[PDB]
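Hey Z.,

So I finally got round to the calcium ion thing we talked about over coffee. Here's the setup:
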Amino acid sequence: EIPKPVAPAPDILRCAYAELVVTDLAKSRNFYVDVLGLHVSYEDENQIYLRSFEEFIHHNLVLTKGPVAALKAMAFRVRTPEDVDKAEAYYQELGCRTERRKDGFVKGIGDALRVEDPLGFPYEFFFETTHVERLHMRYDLYSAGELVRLDHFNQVTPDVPRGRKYLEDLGFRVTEDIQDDEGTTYAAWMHRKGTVHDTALTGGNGPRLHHVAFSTHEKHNIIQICDKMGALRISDRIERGPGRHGVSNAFYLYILDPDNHRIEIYTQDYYTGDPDNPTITWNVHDNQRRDWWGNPVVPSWYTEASKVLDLDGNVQEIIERTDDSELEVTIGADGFSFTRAGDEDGSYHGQAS
Amino acid sequence: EIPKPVAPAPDILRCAYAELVVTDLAKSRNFYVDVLGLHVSYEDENQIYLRSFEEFIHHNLVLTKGPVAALKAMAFRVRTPEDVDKAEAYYQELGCRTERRKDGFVKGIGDALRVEDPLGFPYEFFFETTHVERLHMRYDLYSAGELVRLDHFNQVTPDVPRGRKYLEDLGFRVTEDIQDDEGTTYAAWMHRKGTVHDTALTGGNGPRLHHVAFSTHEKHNIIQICDKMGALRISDRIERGPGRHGVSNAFYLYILDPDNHRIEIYTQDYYTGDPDNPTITWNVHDNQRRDWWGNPVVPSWYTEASKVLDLDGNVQEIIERTDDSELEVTIGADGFSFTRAGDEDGSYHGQASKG
Amino acid sequence: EIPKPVAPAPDILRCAYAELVVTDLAKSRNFYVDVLGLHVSYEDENQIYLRSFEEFIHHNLVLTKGPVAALKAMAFRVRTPEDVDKAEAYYQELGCRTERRKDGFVKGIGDALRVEDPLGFPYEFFFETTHVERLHMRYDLYSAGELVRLDHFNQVTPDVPRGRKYLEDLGFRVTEDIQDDEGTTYAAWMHRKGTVHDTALTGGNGPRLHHVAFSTHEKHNIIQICDKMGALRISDRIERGPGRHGVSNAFYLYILDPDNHRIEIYTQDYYTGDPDNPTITWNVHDNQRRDWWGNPVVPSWYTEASKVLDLDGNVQEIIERTDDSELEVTIGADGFSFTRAGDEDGSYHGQASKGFKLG
Amino acid sequence: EIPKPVAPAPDILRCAYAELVVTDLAKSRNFYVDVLGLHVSYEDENQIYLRSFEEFIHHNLVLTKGPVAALKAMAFRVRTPEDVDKAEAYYQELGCRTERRKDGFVKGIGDALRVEDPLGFPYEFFFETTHVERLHMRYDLYSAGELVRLDHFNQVTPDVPRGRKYLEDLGFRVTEDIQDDEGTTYAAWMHRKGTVHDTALTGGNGPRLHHVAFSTHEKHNIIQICDKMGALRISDRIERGPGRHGVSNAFYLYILDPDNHRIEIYTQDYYTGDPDNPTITWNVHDNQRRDWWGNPVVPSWYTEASKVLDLDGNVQEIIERTDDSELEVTIGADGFSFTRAGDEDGSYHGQASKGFKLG
Ligand SMILES: [Ca+2]
Ligand SMILES: [Cl-]
Ligand SMILES: [Cl-]
Ligand SMILES: [Cl-]
Ligand SMILES: [Cl-]
Ligand SMILES: [Co+2]
Ligand SMILES: [Co+2]
Ligand SMILES: [Co+2]
Ligand SMILES: [Co+2]
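And the result:
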């Protein structure tokens, strides 16, 4: 019921950066630079611009001081300058509020379009960006926990099929999803760049930003982040993991920044660039779907997420999911999960694993 | 309370092997050989003798068919044949039951002494053992989850200070322990070979065997064991982990064999061979003591453990711990743990960490 | 001098598979299945079809028994069935010999076009392929040296700029290259799928196939391949490495199969999918350009490569390189290389790095 | 030829530290601290005291400014204060020169004995040492290339059996060695702490110090050291490696400090603490004995090593090896090596492996 525009979709290359509003810039800096080791592309007293080890565009993350912590923009790079015009015509046809700035919203981005998308998320589309030193061989700077690329976003929205069709029309291809036999969709993963995803939809009250994910080269780099957080006596900011995912097959960790923005560290998913890439559907009751090793998913992972802003910088009103809750059907009083389909041995009932 | 003998202690080198009684030899073989990739030194219809990738002695694990799953013997190798005579005299002086066989209790071990020790555990001391092909460079056999050495045992016993003193007289050096501010000791780790431990004491009803631990080379080898168990749809046999330990600083995993015998996979602890190796004491309420990342310890890890047999093959009676329970004081209804000492933020009241 | 056709280029997704002719199918099976752990999708007395751990198309490697070991086809998957028609019209405009088979040349591929390309290489274009079980979570099968994807081909050709221009018109984008200060190009890397490359051109007498490359997840997986070859006492089949590449930044190893076909194992290069991805040009005398740690490149790496076949199955005639030789200008008696540009300290004159001369 | 004393040998725990004389303290600091990431326990204008990630004694490496770069002392820790007295009586009975300092030779060491041992090496024995913060869980400091322990020394001496017997009488057990079928020993490895070695003897002119070795946790840590040296454009200081050893089975790398002192990075050898630990003998012509993958050993590895000092601080005179040279018999012009014993295929005659010859 989000209508497909007659205007052609912009050609989206990949997720590129997120602008997060933070309440204490210095404490956010400590987390993203001193703990996590992201690289400074620019900073002043209002903003810090950060990039990953292998990036050549200006930044992957912008931290902006503001009164209420929230996602301000999730940005996708498009293939040509003309694609920003296409994005503008496309969202205007969808009836969405748009704002175009020929010189960008943040430093190091040129001509850019921000929109309040049909799911209430602040999307940005741009092509032009200031190139910086690509640090991919700067092993003199490489951290034991080095974050090497921006991998994806993950959005909480109440109606997953409705959002999925809209992103499919935008050219995103679904690689994996979670469903049940009654026909409810709980989550979907979709891509442009030929990894498992550039964004994903998690069923829940929204719009809220569930997480931003960075990749590492190897699994030991993720381990090191946990080990460092232990040494810094901030292990209470490790929310979930480390683990192996079922969906995506990636090794992963979820941690919480000082404003409780959730960051995923992620590595070693698989190639999805062929247009007939096989789509994998998991049953919501399969206890290996989210953590392959069957470790339980903490309730906060399902219930907590970041606010998102509209184009005026005000928090978007939240719409409550009416479809079945993944939390309730798996770990709630009436929920259940299995290790082996149809086997009570290794099943969990009204209880997590 | 357990007196120090006048007789000299045997010079113990290291933990060497465990004999575990198992109820179904085929299912146990499938776990230890097919799932975990241990190497068969010998087998027949009653027993399977298994060794790790870098071992040269006959075995690190003997699976013996029997009617009740249990630990039958935890064996330590001693430095010389005369040390087996010393062990016998030492345990005689302690008034323990002993049994000595010049040709061994299990295949590939020679002159051996088994004892019912003062804590009710079946200990074996031996020197003589049949050498086998050391597979340490057999990369044609190397598994992505390869188990490379036997590292330690861990014993459940009701009174940790009492056991600790006895193990110290026997020559084990305590490297780390867990205590509280009220005089209670909850666990201790102690060594002969220059790693964090060869055995360890966990406070609880006992004697029971908490686990046997094998090492891997690298952390990714432990991750692969988890990944393989997922692919085999036996992830319900992963009990706890993977994680980083606080105590020992080792990367770890606990899994359960077909008879619920607990196996730890362990890697990358530190050198303890100097005699003034600094001893580390953790507070029982420190939520980074067991898992450094603050992940919760499932109650089964505290409550479940394997039976142990006496020298007649009968199960040892269980004596209940009267000291405070590590489970109850940390994750029970009146339990408590902290992330930072004295900080309410990141503390847990009456429940386990991580929500 | 290869002109840009008026006909549209086919939309190529990625490299997909190679067909290698092998002389002893059993010995080749031992290497690829028993030593390297590739997964069999089909086999019989004549061919063995193999795939990597994360693949869903039918195969990444076909071993075909034949009298003369050679590359028979390097295959690229195209985006749609109609792109096979575009490939056909494109190479016909180029004046190249083509052959179309609606039911494929090898099992598990459908409608396919093979061509003798302007550099003399047998390229295949196809869309249709038989899907197989994607083994990406089959950790019960996973080996300590697991090969997880097909990454690229590497082609030996005498005139690199000529070939580079042709591949650019086909839609490949150059990511890295090696040149000198007086305008000679020694090598170029170029991509479709958003890694450093799907194919690459190495200056030398050609056409010859330099190597086929497979990926691993981690660097330790590459180390294990070496360790296993030592245990199997075939360490003489380790040609070069393991190392860190300069060009591509990937961890690597080169090994030789029973017919001397060269296989590279490769991991952890970077993303190139943005259309203004910065190109990187290295100086040929930079001793960190091929091995970042400065380890010497063995001369066989420069001189030895596989024969390639035409569409009749006959060996393509070799044409000699007339531009300067990378081997000669870096490690030959009149060559040189440097660690730091302009610094005599850490420079090597008339010999390779680390203290060896050429055998 | 070196008699076993009647006096009892001191009980040696392990290698503990080396004192190296360096010519430019700031340049040496840049290598050991900025490049390699060792942790500073103390420094002033004359010395730098350094320790590894998991150490609790004061240091593993003392860098001492002086006019001539050299090993000044290889230090072993003993089990008790009374073992220092035993060391003094033991070496006095061997007829060696000894010097005892109740408050140490270097800061953070207490009562210490230095000796000119029968092979001309400056050994120190001590028990007392200042404990420092053990940084084994300080993951806030941990480097991608972190050196976690001091593992061993390696000594160049002309007569290996002569030195091996003396070290055996001192309590070291030989774990592996290299010999040929004609009675020559080329190298021996020997331990106290239950790893492959605490010291080792390499046949050549001596006394000279071949290297000091530090361990890492994982193989990727050694890879990162290489990668960092590339990024710092000091790849010319990577001498040999990275590799898998045959002898010791450890993953390894050799690098060269500013005064050319050789440092090995090392990981994942095996347990040797049992008294009947099987002793492994490799043949000197086995091309997998030093590098398991068959990579050639550069001539500098055989010919270059650090000077060692006597107790007066003067350089020890070098005695020439008369036994056969490992270089000459393996990679020399009349050399030979094999991949598979008894197989001509994969054998090397008068040259090194993998296409190289002596520079
Ligand atoms: Ca001979
Ligand atoms: Cl998940
Ligand atoms: Cl624990
Ligand atoms: Cl290269
Ligand atoms: Cl060596
Ligand atoms: Co995610
Ligand atoms: Co344990
Ligand atoms: Co290549
Ligand atoms: Co060494």
